Amino acid sequence: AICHDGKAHFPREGVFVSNGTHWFVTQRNFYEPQIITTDNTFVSGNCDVVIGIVNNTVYDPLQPELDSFKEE
Ligand X SMILES: *[C@@H]1O[C@H](CO[C@@H]2O[C@@H](C)[C@@H](O)[C@@H](O)[C@@H]2O)[C@@H](O[C@@H]2O[C@H](CO)[C@@H](O[C@@H]3O[C@H](CO[C@H]4O[C@H](CO)[C@@H](O)[C@H](O)[C@@H]4O)[C@@H](O)[C@H](O[C@H]4O[C@H](CO)[C@@H](O)[C@H](O)[C@@H]4O)[C@@H]3O)[C@H](O)[C@H]2NC(C)=O)[C@H](O)[C@H]1NC(C)=O
Ligand Y SMILES: *[C@@H]1O[C@H](CO[C@@H]2O[C@@H](C)[C@@H](O)[C@@H](O)[C@@H]2O)[C@@H](O[C@@H]2O[C@H](CO)[C@@H](O[C@@H]3O[C@H](CO)[C@@H](O)[C@H](O[C@H]4O[C@H](CO)[C@@H](O)[C@H](O)[C@@H]4O)[C@@H]3O)[C@H](O)[C@H]2NC(C)=O)[C@H](O)[C@H]1NC(C)=O
Ligand Z SMILES: *[C@@H]1O[C@H](CO)[C@@H](O[C@@H]2O[C@H](CO)[C@@H](O[C@@H]3O[C@H](CO)[C@@H](O)[C@H](O)[C@@H]3O)[C@H](O)[C@H]2NC(C)=O)[C@H](O)[C@H]1NC(C)=O
Radius of gyration of the chain (CA): 13
Chain residues binding another protein by CB under 8 A are: 1, 8, 10, 15, 28, 42, 44-45, 49-52
If phi over 0 gives left and psi between -120 and 50 gives alpha, with beta otherwise, what is residue 6?
A: left
Question: Which among ligand Y, ligand X, a copy of itself, none contacts residue 53 (Cβ within 5 to 8 A by kind)?
Answer: ligand X
Least distance between ligand Y and beta carbon 23 (Å): 8
Question: CA-to-CA distance for 31 and 51, rounded, in angstroms?
Answer: 25
Question: Which among another protein, ligand X, ligand Z, none contacts residue 3 (Cβ within 5 to 8 A by kind)?
Answer: ligand Z
- Candidates 24-32, 34-42, 48-56, 62-70; binding stretch for ligand X (CB under 6 A): 48-56
Q: Is 37 strand, coil or helix? A: strand
